[PDB]
Structure formats: structure tokens, C-alpha cells
Amino acid sequence: TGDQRFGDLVFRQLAPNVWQHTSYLDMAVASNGLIVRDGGRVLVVDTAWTDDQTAQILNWIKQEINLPVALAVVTHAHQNKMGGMDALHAAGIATYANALSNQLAPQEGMVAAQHSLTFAANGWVEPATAPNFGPLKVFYPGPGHTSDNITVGIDGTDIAFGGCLIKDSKAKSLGNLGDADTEHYAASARAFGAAFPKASMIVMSHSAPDSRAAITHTARMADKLR
Ligand SMILES: [Zn+2]
Numbered sequence: 543t544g545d546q547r548f549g550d551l552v553f554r555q556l557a558p559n560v561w562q563h564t565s566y567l568d569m570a571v572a573s574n575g576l577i578v579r580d581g582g583r584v585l586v587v588d589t590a591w592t593d594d595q596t597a598q599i600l601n602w603i604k605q606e607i608n609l610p611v612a613l614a615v616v617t618h619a620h621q622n623k624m625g626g627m628d629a630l631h632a633a634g635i636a637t638y639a640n641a642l643s644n645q646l647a648p649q650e651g652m653v654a655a656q657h658s659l660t661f662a663a664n665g666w667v668e669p670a671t672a673p674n675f676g677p678l679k680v681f682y683p684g685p686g687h688t689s690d691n692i693t694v695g696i697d698g699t700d701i702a703f704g705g706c707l708i709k710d711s712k713a714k715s716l717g718n719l720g721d722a723d724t725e726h727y728a729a730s731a732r733a734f735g736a737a738f739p740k741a742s743m744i745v746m747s748h749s750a751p752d753s754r755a756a757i758t759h760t761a762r763m764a765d766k767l768r
Pocket residue numbers: 618619620687688706
């Protein structure tokens with residue numbers, strides 16, 4: 543209830559101007575991103591697993607929102623986040639990613655975003671690299687899930703997007719591979735929480751939106767790794 547199926551994708555409205563988009567890849571693994579309505583334009587966080595799935599995202603937006611997609615930001619260089627970059631570019635959408643994500647993308651078989659984000663030493667995005675991001679507040683919490691993994695808060699809402707960094711409050715593991723920073727993971731998770739201290743709805747890549755318990759639980763799980 544509240545979920546719209548659209549082809550093989552699923553869309554859930556989280557707020558008047560925010561939807562979660564979900565795509566699947568058989569390895570039947572879900573991956574979430576965000577769609578944000580900002581006045582006369584749409585902003586997208588993360589692609590779907592594939593170009594064709596991402597094109598469907600844009601199809602859904604055209605139908606349900608009917609506003610031009612101005613830009614997209616992807617939160618790290620893995621297929622579930624950057625797999626549909628070509629689809630974004632073919633639609634004339636300006637794309638942004640961590641400079642490191644763009645550096646890693648060719649090795650991961652991903653297409654690099656058109657623009658590179660860089661970050662101050664306190665983790666907040668450098669304003670000039672993220673021009674006209676509207677309500678999107680982009681924060682690099684430090685290495686965790688990956689070295690390049692970044693997070694996005696939505697001003698005007700209680701929503702913060704933790705991507706693959708944050709696991710749900712009942713997650714039985716962190717499901718990291720070799721590119722995880724198991725030393726700094728805990729601190730990065732907590733940095734994310736501190737960057738968006740008022741966010742009460744935490745959106746993440748691999749499960750439904752959860753409370754702030756997702757953040758503290760993730761950090762506590764990561765504490766066991768150090
Ligand atoms: Zn990942």
C-alpha cells in the first residue's frame with residue numbers, strides 16, 4: 543500500500559516532494575534511490591542497476607511529476623548507484639558524483655558522472671562544485687561502506703539519505719566487501735547522523751526507510767569490526 547509498481551520498478555512517496563525509487567537485479571536484490579521535486583524541476587539521487595531501469599525511472603517521473611529532471615547525484619561507484627549513468631546523460635541530465643567515485647568508475651565498469659564533487663575537511667560539499675543543488679545537502683561522512691561513499695539530506699524535510707553506508711535497525715550484518723573501511727566505518731556512520739541531527743526518516747539503499755535507530759545500530763555493528 544502506497545507503493546506504485548511501474549514496469550519492474552517500485553516507487554514510494556515519502557513526502558509531498560520526495561519519492562523513493564527501487565530497482566531490482568537478479569544475483570532479486572533491491573536498491574533504493576530518491577526523487578526530489580524542487581519547484582519547476584526534478585532532482586535524482588542514484589541511478590537504478592541498469593540504463594534501461596533508469597530510463598524507466600525517467601519515464602515514471604515524466605508521467606507522475608511531469609517536470610524536467612535538472613540533475614542527478616550518485617552516492618558511490620557501485621552498479622546499483624551508477625549503473626544507469628548513460629541513461630541520465632542521454633536525457634540531458636547534469637550528473638554529479640564524488641571526485642573519487644568518478645575516479646573509481648572506469649575500474650568498476652561504470653560511466654563517470656559529468657561533474658566531480660569535492661569536500662571540505664569537515665565533510666560538507668564545496669559549494670562551487672554543487673551549484674544550484676536546491677534542497678540537496680551533500681555530506682561526505684568519511685570512508686565506510688566504500689571510500690567514496692557520500693550522503694544527502696533534503697532541506698524542507700525530515701529525510702536524510704545514507705545510501706549503502708547505513709543499514710536498517712534490524713540488519714544482521716553490514717555486508718561489506720574488501721572496499722569497506724572497517725576502521726572508520728563506525729565514525730563515518732555517526733558523522734552522518736551528526737550532519738543531519740534533525741532527520742527522523744533515514745533512507746538507505748537496501749531496505750525501507752527507517753528511524754534514527756538505523757544510524758546508531760549501524761555504528762554499533764561497525765564498532766564490532768574495529
Ligand atoms: Zn556499494
